[PDB]
Amino acid sequence: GPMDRYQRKIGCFIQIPNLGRGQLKYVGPVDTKAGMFAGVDLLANIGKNDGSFMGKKYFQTEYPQSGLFIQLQKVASLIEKASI
């Protein structure tokens, strides 16, 4: 409430439209950005980051560009369907 239901699914896998399978690793705000975000590990270098942003660690990624922040509203129903 509001983030609790999504936070409980950290570690789940979700299938992101036009991106692929990603592991949910973080849910919350990102410094200097608007809104809430899911931080996902795409398990290939098709993301943007290594789980850090502006010098702060948000989550751990397998590869140097496998992490990605996605606006939470875009994946909120995928997360809700996923099982932990």
Strand order in the sheet with 36-41: 13-16, 20-29, 36-41, 67-71
- What CA–CA distances, in Å, run from 1 to 4, 6, 8, 22? 5, 9, 11, 23
Query: Resolution in A for the shown PDB structure?
Result: 1.9
Give the Cα separation of 56 and 2 in Å (integer). Answer: 23
Cα 10 to the center of its chain, rounded Å:
9
Experimental method: X-ray
Question: Who's near 19: CB < 8 A, 6+ residues apart?
Answer: 42, 46, 68
d(CA 25, CA 35): 17
